[PDB]
């Protein structure tokens, strides 16, 4: 190809403007087989320039100069400039040295992590550039493993400044486009680490309907399998593959049970210590693999072998999806150790995706992330996170952050696995983010005191958990549309606020604030209520323009950085004047698809949103002040329509068009009910209730308002009714 | 020291005395140069109010008004005249707040809640600005000192306050813009109005002298020493003081004991953010709650 | 030298670069014909203008393909060069090894501007003469970030005063200017006292420079260069000999409020030591806290 150059021992392939492949080879030969990373080099023609010598190269785009002085690849040999003034000395990339300005990605797993941890580098810089090194093994035409590759360098030199979404378009063109998830994928998950038998598991499962809460995933742990009762001669019960008979004495019949709840069914599989011979698979498995079966000759894990892999998919997995398994939970945490070199988390991941996909359309795994590449295998899997404030705090940057290596479907484990410490608040507000977050999977430790159950807690926590969890449903068209546009577009649902505002320093200084799919922006609280005011709070950065509450309408004018108090039942989400969220009407009904969707308008603006479906688009525009729904393909669908405070239209069937423009523009929200309620919950002294609410009344000029709270001895009551005056002005 | 000769200064007498120790002279020079030039300053002060006190001590003893009145005499029935002990009218043309507390020494400032009556309302020294009616917490470094007057307020000073003389052969007539106003100099031997009606000042006397009048509008001397009765226009003069939001705002920063880095993002933000509410809202969420109350009173009265 | 430059046509020329393609003159100090570029096409017509002297301000690290530090290259080559148009000329630059004091002056660089900051720098600067680099410039008062004090600037300025180098130099800042008049009235006239000292010494570190020139003995001194054998020598890490004739213990710690005076633990070795400044006598050999107000700085001298 013209975007190829080859310079001494060295190979530069121009894959686009932004985006360099470096390679070199000791053997002249260089690698065109996919990686475990890179699924296609077949890029657009480009434009760039060179200047070649007798002893250096310069590759020239419309973003970097790229310099190779000859011989092997070193700091002074291979070196870069960007085209680029975002930083005053940062704009050099050399090779095998760290620049500053890496916004981050992801990590294996929050196993045993309690808050923060450390993070990989991503694709994305503050500074313009970032190279992500190719170390993997080469793959076969039909992705199996072929050895090393011939490229003994292979590096990706991204140069896209600030233009982040591109990069990560053109990250998943390189790496294959995440697939599409299953619709089911994207309701509650019910988990815990319990030993259920079949009918303390179908009477929970009857008690969610009994309580109006919805679930699309019931999960079982690894107490499905023989735990106890395997003799210690074998090792411990952590890996399984055979029903424990008392609790499960008909798992065909229980897993149907499941089935007819409209529930799909994954279970725990501890792949680590293979098939010994207790197993029930062990005969079939030992025959398969010419096993020693008088010395009961262990089929160990080894993801390398492909007989093993046959035996595990077809004679250990097999059985249990004819019993009605849907989707595999691989739980690994037993290394990096192969004699490939491949890590098995990779192997378990990329394989079992693949063999999932026989059984049933568009099917998932759940699994720890196992490096750059394997959001082709979703789900992600964080794991056994500490219960903490400190957890939760981490969680919302850690989910917007990996986004930035193109893994955008973590599972986290709702309000925290294991350890930490029982604080109703901190369950509740973790509940909020899951319900906004990639995937929302309520999980907990082999404690008797960590259930998710929303009815362990008080009767206010309850109340608050199940609106949440029916909200979850309720977001599933909107979830399932940006699910699509993941797949097809490749961006990300949960994106960090510098992929919409790559200039705004703000951007960068509201760690845990993101943007839910294209429509709502998301600042969870994740830190303990002040006792004093009875509400939590975030600093929230509004960009340019008029927002709403999701939830209140509460306005708030951009551009501005302001400290927002929600009680602890209330999660701080905003909409723009013009956006229109698409809402499940029946979400505790049972239904492939939505037979009513609540179209959501937010005044002040024109707006748009295409709901994608299985089977379906639908385009709800508002322009002007008219509101109209087109789709593709006719149905029987009955359409509501909310503008702001008002339903216009229930239950209507079809294509049409409404005019707004006579309706009220204006939510209820309003400054003196929103003073009162924050006044009345707070414990402080009713002398200072009194006069806030006495003066807040009196003062007419909104100045003068301003500085009599300043006056106020409560630093945080000023903020709370800073917050209040603010919406107000 | 300094703040107690501040307050000394606008009391009803200004009398400096101390103790039989070796080391509580009240001598200006006793103390190092900023605080010895700041005494000074406030000690030829005192003599150039002496018209003023001198006027307010035959008022007290024709007509029985106190020179120094608390808040309550002309606000009764403002529960805000009650709840600030230390702030009092001083004759009828200015309203002193003294600052009784150590200064912040991260601001280095000193501070003292002010209640502004209904009003415009202005430094007597500076000019800055104040919207009654609020109450505003003020700053003020070591040297300075609230003392506020009215749109309107006309206050005559000794232009001579170092010349031994019985009574002052030159007045400075100072004139807070924005209002009509007026005050009466009572002397052992003359009575003097100088009104302010419609933009115009006039100066009138029961009995004729060789006095010279200065006159002051805001910030500019608009007539320098003219002897006997006159008028003058002053509709097309300036009515603005020079005090400014971006020299005083810079001023309060570069003072301050704090990062260098806060000072720098204060000073873009401020100077950037373009709307009031959302230069109020930036200084919201400054760390430094005392910083918070200053950087307000700025933007209060730059509002 | 990048194509908008005002020397690059004459570069391009000379290093035969490709202009239609805006090839840029990589800094190379490797190349000799980068080098001759630099120094007679660069540099060479901003000294024709007037420029006596080159600040080398060299912070992108130590990368080069011969292995030599491109900041070593940088003194070594500069240093030469700047001996064409003046005699005895300098650089100011940071240190490059064991050596670079072949090239002077020494820059330390963006210090951060802090009560901490100052009480490193004096054991700093002793502590280099170890290692024969004894023309130390430090940014005086501290460079940036850190914090305003105006006692912490008036204490940097007195060591200044009494360091290899007097540079008053700061940040990017509209808060951080070294000017005297900057602080009140006291922290101003004790500053413009302490710069005109500076001058007043002048002859006094001639005179110590061609010593260091000729016989290799350092300006600044560790207490331990003279009293190698007294164990106080080496546990007071600020205080040092400056010259043969002074000894100098900066204050470098906030004042104490309740007495309106900063302090330091001073050694005096075996003798009569006098305050150079008001002639308050101390007998040696003694460890005493001594006090001194904000505008005195503690500097002795023996009897003799
Ligand atoms: O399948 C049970 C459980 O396994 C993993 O978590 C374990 C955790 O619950 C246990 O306390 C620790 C202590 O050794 O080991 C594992 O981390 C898995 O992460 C979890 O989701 C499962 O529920
Ligand atoms: O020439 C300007 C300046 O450059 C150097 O210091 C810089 C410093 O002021 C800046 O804040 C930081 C932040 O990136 O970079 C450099 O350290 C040099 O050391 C200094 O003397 C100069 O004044």
């Not at 990373?37 to 002893?55: A, H, L, P, T």
């Not at 970097?64 to 704009?91: I, M, P, R």
């Not at 990300?492 to 294209?518: I, K, S, T």
């Not at 929200?669 to 200072?688: C, G, H, K, M, V």
């Amino acid at each position: 190809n013209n975007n190829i150059i080859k310079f001494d021992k060295a190979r530069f392939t121009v894959l686009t403007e932004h985006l360099i492949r470096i390679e070199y080879s000791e053997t002249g030969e260089f690698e065109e087989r996919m990686t475990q990373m890179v699924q296609n080099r077949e890029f657009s023609e480009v434009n760039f320039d060179i200047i070649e010598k007798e002893e250096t190269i310069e590759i020239i785009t419309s973003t970097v100069h790229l310099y190779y002085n000859g011989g092997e690849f070193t700091n002074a040999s291979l070196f870069a400039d960007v085209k680029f003034n975002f930083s005053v000395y940062s704009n050099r990339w050399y090779f095998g040295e760290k620049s500053d300005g890496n916004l981050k990605g992801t990590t294996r797993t929050l196993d045993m992590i309690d808050g923060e941890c450390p993070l990989e580098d991503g694709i994305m810089s503050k500074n313009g550039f970032a190279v992500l090194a190719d170390k993997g093994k080469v793959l076969t035409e039909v992705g199996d493993i072929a050895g090393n590759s011939v490229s003994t360098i292979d590096l990706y030199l991204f140069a896209y400044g600030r233009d982040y979404r591109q990069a990560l378009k053109d990250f998943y063109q390189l790496t294959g486009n995440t697939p599409k998830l299953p619709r089911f994928a994207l309701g509650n998950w019910w988990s815990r680490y319990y030993d259920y038998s079949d009918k303390s598991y179908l009477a929970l499962m009857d008690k969610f309907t009994d309580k109006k809460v919805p679930l699309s995933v019931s999960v079982i742990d690894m107490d499905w399998h023989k735990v106890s009762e395997v003799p210690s001669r074998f090792g411990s019960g952590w890996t399984g593959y055979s029903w424990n008979k008392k609790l499960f004495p008909n798992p065909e019949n229980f897993i149907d049970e499941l089935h007819q709840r409209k529930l799909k069914v994954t279970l725990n599989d501890h792949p680590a210590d293979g098939i010994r011979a207790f197993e029930d698979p062990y005969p079939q498995v030992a025959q398969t693999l010419d096993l020693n079966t008088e010395l009961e000759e262990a089929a160990k894990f080894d993801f390398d072998n492909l007989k093993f892999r046959k035996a595990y998919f077809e004679e250990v997995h097999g059985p249990l999806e004819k019993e009605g398994v849907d989707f595999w939970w691989i739980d690994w945490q037993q290394g990096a150790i192969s004699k490939s070199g491949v890590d098995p988390l990779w192997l378990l991941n990329h394989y079992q995706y693949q063999n999932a996909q026989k059984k049933h359309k568009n099917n998932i795994i759940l699994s720890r992330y196992a490096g750059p590449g394997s959001h082709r295998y979703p789900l992600g899997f964080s794991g056994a996170s500490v219960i903490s404030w400190a957890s939760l705090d981490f969680q919302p940057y850690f989910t917007s952050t990996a986004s930035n290596i193109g893994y955008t479907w973590w599972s986290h484990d709702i309000g925290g696995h294991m350890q930490g410490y029982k604080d109703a608040e901190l369950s509740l507000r973790w509940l909020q983010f899951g319900v906004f977050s990639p995937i929302n999977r309520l999980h907990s430790s082999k404690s008797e005191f960590t259930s998710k159950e929303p009815w362990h807690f008080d009767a206010v926590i309850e109340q608050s958990m199940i609106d949440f969890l029916q909200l979850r449903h309720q977001l599933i068209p909107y979830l399932y549309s940006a699910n699509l546009i993941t797949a097809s577009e490749g961006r990300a649902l949960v994106e960090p606020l510098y992929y919409e505002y790559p200039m705004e320093e703000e951007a960068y200084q509201h760690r845990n604030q993101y943007l839910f799919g294209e429509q709502l922006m998301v600042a969870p609280i994740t830190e303990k209520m002040n006792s004093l005011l009875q509400m939590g709070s975030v600093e929230v950065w509004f960009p340019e323009g008029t927002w709403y509450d999701f939830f209140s309408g509460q306005p708030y004018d951009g551009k501005v950085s302001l400290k927002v108090y929600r009680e602890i039942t209330e999660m701080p989400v905003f909409a723009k004047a013009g956006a229109i969220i698409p809402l499940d009407k029946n979400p505790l009904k049972k239904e492939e698809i939505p037979s009513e969707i609540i179209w959501k308008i937010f005044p002040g603006a024109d707006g748009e949103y295409l709901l994608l479906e299985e089977d379906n688009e639908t385009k709800a525009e508002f322009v002007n002040g008219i509101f109209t729904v087109t789709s593709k393909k006719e149905s029987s669908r009955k359409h509501t329509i909310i503008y702001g405070e008002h339903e216009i239209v229930s239950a209507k069937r079809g294509e049409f068009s409404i005019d707004l423009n006579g309706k009220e523009e204006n939510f209820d929200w309003n400054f003196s009910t929103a003073l009162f309620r924050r006044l009345d919950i707070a414990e402080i002294s009713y002398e200072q209730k009194d006069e806030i609410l006495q003066q807040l009344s009196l003062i007419e000029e909104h100045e003068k308002q301003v500085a009599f709270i300043k006056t106020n001895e409560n630093q945080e009551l000023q903020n709370s009714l800073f917050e209040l005056l603010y919406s107000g002005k």
